[PDB]
Design a protein around this ligand. Structure first.
Ligand SMILES: C[C@H](CCC(=O)O)[C@H]1CC[C@H]2[C@@H]3CC[C@@H]4C[C@H](O)CC[C@]4(C)[C@H]3C[C@H](O)[C@]12C
Ligand SMILES: C[C@H](CCC(=O)O)[C@H]1CC[C@H]2[C@@H]3CC[C@@H]4C[C@H](O)CC[C@]4(C)[C@H]3C[C@H](O)[C@]12C
Length: 83
């Protein structure tokens, strides 16, 4: 399909950046949360401009403990919502 060709068309630079981006994603959660900032940074590494407001919204809509971030259980609900 289209996404498979797209990833195949990535430069080697972009691929090493894409992998770093996931490394940083994982590093973010090592503290038990995923925040807007953490996600902003994964996005930058992917070459995109952060969309902090849209991220906070996605967080806020599942944020039941009022932390302003997502824990593991809130991240699961967030996950089923993107897809
Ligand atoms: C499948 C292509 C490779 C295409 C090719 O053969 O060049 C690669 C290139 C970049 C790869 C992604 C980079 C970030 C992630 C790293 C993780 O550790 C494993 C899953 C992810 C999401 C990767 C999945 C997959 O491995 C991708 C999409
Ligand atoms: C964890 C899964 C899938 C992980 C993956 O395949 O990289 C999903 C659920 C919510 C996803 C994030 C929200 C959208 C974000 C906007 C970008 O347009 C693509 C990457 C980001 C930062 C996403 C990273 C990652 O795609 C997440 C956290």
């Amino acid at each position: 399909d289209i996404y498979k060709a797209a990833v195949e068309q990535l430069t080697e630079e972009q691929k090493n950046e894409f992998k770093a981006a996931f490394d940083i994603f994982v590093l973010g959660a090592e503290d038990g949360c995923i925040s807007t900032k953490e996600l902003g940074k994964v996005m930058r590494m992917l070459g995109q401009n952060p969309t902090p407001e849209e991220l906070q919204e996605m967080i806020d809509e599942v944020d039941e403990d009022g932390s302003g971030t997502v824990d593991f259980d809130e991240f699961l609900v967030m996950m089923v919502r993107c897809m």
